[PDB]
């Protein structure tokens, strides 16, 4: 049955601010995207230098 499948637990890999399934997203997605894009931007600044 296709309803028998379930996504397994990813909580060993998930971030701390998306670990709780009873709270919403979109009040922490901008922080995660800002952290990852800050890493990318600082890498780009170093490569440009």
């Amino acid at each position: 049955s296709h309803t028998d499948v379930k996504v397994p637990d990813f909580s060993d890999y998930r971030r701390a601010e998306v670990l709780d399934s009873t709270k919403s997203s979109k009040e922490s997605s901008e922080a995660r995207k800002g952290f990852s894009y800050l890493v990318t931007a600082t890498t780009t600044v170093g490569v440009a230098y």
């Binding site: 499948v5 397994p8 990813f10 890999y13 990852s36 890493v39 990318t40 600082t42 890498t43 170093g46 490569v47 230098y49």
Partner: protein
């Protein structure tokens, strides 16, 4: 004999990974080269303008260039003539051709000391051990005229007389001119003459080390961020 001797490791001020040369020692070593070493050895790839901003000022290096007389020509009637030296002039050769050097130096040719640190094993340690290592020969070793025993020279029979001693010159800054001090100064000057880019090379290496210490974890974080889709992927096989 074919058996030889390794020079030891000396604690130079430029021996460290990010440690520069001591430019006062290079200035003293240039004075040692001018007053002692320049009568036999040449510096064909080093000019006076290389000393500006390293050991001497513009007017000091210009006075150093003007105190020697160099070759110029031809004039309007095609005759060679002597002129006062300039900043773009290279250091003057003691001999016009190597055969004249061999005739003046008892067959032996004094080499051009522009890469003599980089062309010898041990570097300036070898030069410091050679200049301070003149000793009496042991028993069973017969030595001809014009040859001198030096255990750091290969073959232990060098054609160079010991060129430095105590008060062999007078320093401009009042440093006492012992044999070890003069040898250390001229070894520092020869290391600078072999590698004039040394300080800028180490500064560039420090900047490169700081940029790579910043850039390795950031590029690693970018790679792990992009690969975390695959590295946490779960698989399942559900045959019917």
């Amino acid at each position: 004999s074919d058996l030889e001797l390794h020079p030891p490791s000396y604690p130079w001020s430029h021996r460290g990974l990010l440690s520069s040369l001591d430019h006062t020692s290079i200035r003293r070593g240039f004075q040692v080269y001018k007053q002692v070493c320049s009568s036999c050895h040449s510096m064909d790839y080093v000019a006076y303008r290389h000393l500006v901003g390293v050991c001497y000022t513009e007017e000091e290096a210009k006075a150093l260039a003007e105190e020697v007389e160099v070759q110029d020509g031809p004039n309007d009637d095609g005759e060679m003539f002597m002129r006062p030296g300039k900043l773009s002039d290279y250091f003057p050769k003691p001999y016009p051709n190597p055969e004249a050097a061999r005739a003046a130096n008892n067959g032996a040719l004094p080499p051009d000391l522009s890469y003599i640190v980089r062309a010898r094993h041990g570097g300036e340690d070898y030069v410091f051990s050679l200049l301070t290592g003149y000793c009496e020969p042991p028993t069973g070793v017969s030595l001809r005229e014009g040859l001198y025993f030096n255990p750091y020279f290969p073959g232990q029979a060098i054609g160079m007389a010991p060129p430095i001693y105590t008060e062999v010159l007078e320093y401009d800054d009042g440093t006492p001119a012992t044999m070890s001090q003069v040898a250390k100064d001229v070894a520092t000057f020869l290391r600078w003459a072999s590698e004039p880019e040394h300080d800028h090379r180490k500064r560039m290496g420090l900047k490169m080390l700081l940029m790579m210490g910043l850039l390795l974890p950031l590029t690693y974080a970018m790679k792990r961020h992009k690969w975390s889709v695959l590295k946490s992927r779960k698989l399942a096989y559900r045959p019917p």
